[PDB]
Amino acid sequence: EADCGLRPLFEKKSLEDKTERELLESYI
Amino acid sequence: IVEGSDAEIGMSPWQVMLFRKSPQELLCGASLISDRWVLTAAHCLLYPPWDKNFTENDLLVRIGKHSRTRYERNIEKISMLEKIYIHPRYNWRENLDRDIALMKLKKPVAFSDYIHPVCLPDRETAASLLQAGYKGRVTGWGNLKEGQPSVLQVVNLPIVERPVCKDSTRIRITDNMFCAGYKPDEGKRGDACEGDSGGPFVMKSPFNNRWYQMGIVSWGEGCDRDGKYGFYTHVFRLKKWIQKVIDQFG
Amino acid sequence: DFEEIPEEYLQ
Ligand SMILES: O=C(NCc1cc(Cl)ccc1CO)[C@@H]1CCCN1C(=O)CNS(=O)(=O)Cc1ccccc1
Numbered sequence: 004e005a006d007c008g009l010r011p012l013f014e015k016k017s018l019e020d021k022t023e024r025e026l027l028e029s030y031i
Numbered sequence: 032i033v034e035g036s037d038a039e040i041g042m043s044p045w046q047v048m049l050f051r052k053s054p055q056e057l058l059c060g061a062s063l064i065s066d067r068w069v070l071t072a073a074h075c076l077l078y079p080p081w082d083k084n085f086t087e088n089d090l091l092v093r094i095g096k097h098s099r100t101r102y103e104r105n106i107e108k109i110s111m112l113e114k115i116y117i118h119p120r121y122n123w124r125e126n127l128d129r130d131i132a133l134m135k136l137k138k139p140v141a142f143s144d145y146i147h148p149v150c151l152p153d154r155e156t157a158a159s160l161l162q163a164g165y166k167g168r169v170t171g172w173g174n175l176k177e178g179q180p181s182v183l184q185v186v187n188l189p190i191v192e193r194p195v196c197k198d199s200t201r202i203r204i205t206d207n208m209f210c211a212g213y214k215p216d217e218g219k220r221g222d223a224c225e226g227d228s229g230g231p232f233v234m235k236s237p238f239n240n241r242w243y244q245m246g247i248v249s250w251g252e253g254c255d256r257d258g259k260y261g262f263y264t265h266v267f268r269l270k271k272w273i274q275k276v277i278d279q280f281g
Numbered sequence: 282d283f284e285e286i287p288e289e290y291l292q
Pocket residue numbers: 074078125126127202222223224225226227228248249250251252253254260261262263
């Protein structure tokens with residue numbers, strides 16, 4: 004789907020969840 | 032999920048609960064990949080060693096959930112199954128090789144703040160992100176230790192080097208699997224457990240800021256044991272089969 | 282320990 008993987012209550016609002024940064028920091 | 036935490040509302044809007052009609056009970060996790068298709072582990076539907084062989088009419092899917100046991104009126108949506116498709120080379124006899132299945136819903140589900148599909152990886156996203164040390168996220172309503180949660184649980188876990196996965200077990204590992212979890216010397220903990228089967232291992236692409244399902248909760252030896260790891264179906268490796276099924280039955 | 286779901290889904 005064109006909109007897949009973009010969560011209504013997070014990415015679509017530009018709000019982050021409390022632990023997604025842990026994932027980003029691991030992508031070295 | 033062992034050593035996880037309560038999910039935030041709407042944190043995993045692709046999460047699906049596979050639910051037995053009679054007796055009414057949780058069977059597995061699963062994920063929403065479009066308005067009509069749900070992805071799960073084959074062993075959630077077919078596992079002869081445990082006398083498990085479900086038909087479409089045995090099952091429901093519950094989408095948009097947070098609470099494990101409540102009927103979440105005006106939030107969750109419950110769908111009937113039109114058809115189950117199990118990978119034709121799923122190996123339930125030995126090591127759960129190719130542990131993947133699709134379920135087509137009788138009618139499309141309406142998306143909402145709580146219901147939204149996850150992406151499936153392309154070759155490039157899989158090559159970039161499926162690397163040792165890179166973390167993904169596992170979610171489910173399964174047991175809290177090798178007892179049961181009030182709401183959906185979430186844990187972030189690093190992908191493990193393939194030789195370490197191999198050397199942790201006597202089970203034969205294949206290219207259709209990867210393993211994830213912390214090492215004993217790493218201090219931190221966490222794993223999937225009974226009841227988390229079939230749920231998603233997701234990663235957030237740093238390139239386009241979308242969530243991709245890289246794995247399906249497949250198998251382990253115990254839950255959260257030191258020196259053991261959880262094993263996940265390699266979704267990208269089996270995507271040609273996913274596409275063939277959808278292009279021909281959808 | 283599951284709350285009963287509406288009967289319409291079990292028909
Ligand atoms: O329970 C299951 N999956 C849930 C899960 C997933 C993860 Cl990622 C981590 C832990 C857990 C909880 O065990 C599956 C269902 C069928 C059996 N199974 C196993 O895991 C079997 N484990 S074993 O007997 O120790 C070794 C073995 C392996 C594959 C095939 C045969 C034997």
